């Protein structure tokens, strides 16, 4: 877009996705770093 039309584009979302594509092959095993449980995350609080 030329700058005249670029104004329509401002603050429009652009989400992105990904997946490992079949040919992917992770190698050496390495243990998990500490997790953080999600249901234990703080509430918004009214």
């Amino acid at each position: 877009a030329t700058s005249d039309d670029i104004a329509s584009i401002v603050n429009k979302p652009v989400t992105i996705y990904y997946s490992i594509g079949d040919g992917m092959q992770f190698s050496q095993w390495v243990g998990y770093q500490p997790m953080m449980i999600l249901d234990q995350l703080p509430a918004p609080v009214v």
């Binding site: 040919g23 092959q25 190698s27 500490p34 997790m35 703080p42 609080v45």
Partner: protein, 397 residues
């Protein structure tokens, strides 16, 4: 050119290939590869040693608990009662507001899946010199609700499945926890940040000291006991859903408390500027874009009758830059159905305009228009850094 007069196929468009599907399904792409038949390859020394699989990960012990075991533990003493589900736990004593937890590899690979079933395996390394001797139960009680989690003692434990062990020369074993439940699979103990739909564990492990440790005087009074968890031979998981776990790579978190005030999402970054529908462009108002009719909208302040409010940013660095940083503002409806924010010179002018607008006054009034900042003050018009928080100053009318 024979003509092809017969009727065309009748297909229905969709915008996108399936995101969920991921197996027996060719998935067409606009490859950024040069050759169209090319595909990544593995030179003989770069070969993938590890066959990623839920079972290949589940079948790896990770230390999950470290019981101390002193001589003076009487025959009844509890050592642990960790739940018989993969999500066995060991909290880190960190300073963080949101504490991290260790997990067994089975406890992480099984958080990704809604359901699990089959045996677990708790290896117990009872770390002792051969001259230490003792005996301990490692029981398993099916169907203990948390209210029944207490009232336990080793003798009630003996009624159900259990395993006695004799620490003497061999100093390690591997109790293989049974899967006893009415449910062919079993639902996750935790969940994506959503407390309901967090079923507690099927059953509970126990490890009481059946015969108290009897050390020689020349060896230690205390014995460590390591509890390792591993997915059993029959451990298996099915439905994929949101992991109940997040990596510690970034432990930042942001509460959505409503008390602080800020521009509506998607209307920031904003900068002070002119707009033709307001005071005929003579006076400033925040804008999220250079194009016309792109004024930032603002949340309606909750003002109880007989009072008034005006804004003051918590950080003057983040305010949009005019001739001066704009730390002060008065949010009023634009008459276009959304609440425009009007920057002001100072807290005083803002308080005055606030006295006017809640005073039965209106934007068109001369007493108000004097208080609006004139367009010449627009300056460079730098955008505010992100969507900065606005403290809500409040005063009696």
């Amino acid at each position: 050119n024979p003509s092809y007069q017969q009727s065309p196929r009748h297909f229905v468009p969709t915008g996108m290939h399936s995101l969920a599907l991921g197996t027996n399904l060719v998935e067409p792409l606009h490859a950024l590869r040069l050759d169209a038949a090319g595909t990544t390859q593995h030179p003989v020394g770069c070969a993938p040693d590890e066959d990623m699989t839920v079972s290949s990960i589940a079948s790896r012990y990770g230390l999950i608990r470290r019981v101390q075991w002193k001589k003076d533990h009487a025959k009844g003493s509890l050592l642990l009662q960790l739940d018989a589900d993969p999500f066995v736990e060991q909290r880190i004593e960190g300073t963080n507001p949101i504490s991290l937890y260790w997990f067994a590899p089975v406890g992480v690979v099984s958080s990704m899946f809604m359901q699990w079933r089959g045996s677990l395996e708790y290896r117990f390394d009872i770390i002792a010199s051969q001259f230490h001797t003792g005996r301990l139960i490692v029981g398993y009680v099916p169907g203990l609700t948390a209210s029944l989690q207490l009232q336990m003692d080793y003798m009630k434990l003996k009624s159900s499945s259990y395993v006695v062990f004799d620490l003497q020369e061999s100093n390690s074993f591997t109790f293989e926890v049974p899967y006893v439940s009415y449910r062919p699979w079993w639902v996750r103990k935790y969940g994506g940040n959503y407390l309901p739909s967090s079923t507690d564990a099927p059953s509970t492990l126990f490890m009481y000291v059946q015969v108290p440790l009897i050390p020689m005087e020349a060896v230690s009074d205390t014995i460590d006991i390591n509890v390792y968890v591993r997915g059993g031979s029959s451990f298996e998981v099915c439905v994929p859903v949101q992991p109940s776990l997040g990596l510690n790579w970034n432990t930042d978190f942001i509460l959505r408390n409503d008390e602080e005030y800020r521009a509506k999402t998607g209307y920031a970054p904003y900068y002070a500027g002119v707009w033709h529908s307001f005071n005929n462009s003579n006076s400033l108002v925040f804008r999220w874009g250079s194009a016309s009719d792109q004024i930032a909208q603002w949340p309606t302040i909750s003002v109880p009758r007989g009072e008034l409010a005006f804004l003051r940013i918590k950080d003057g660095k983040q305010a949009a830059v005019g001739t001066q940083p704009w730390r002060t503002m008065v949010v009023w409806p634009s008459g276009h159905g959304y609440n425009i924010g009007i920057p002001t010179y100072n807290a005083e002018r803002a308080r005055q305009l606030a006295q006017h607008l809640y005073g039965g006054g209106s934007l068109t009034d001369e007493k108000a228009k004097q208080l609006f900042v004139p367009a010449n003050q627009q300056g460079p018009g730098k955008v505010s850094n992100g969507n900065p928080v606005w403290e809500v100053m409040r005063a009696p009318l």
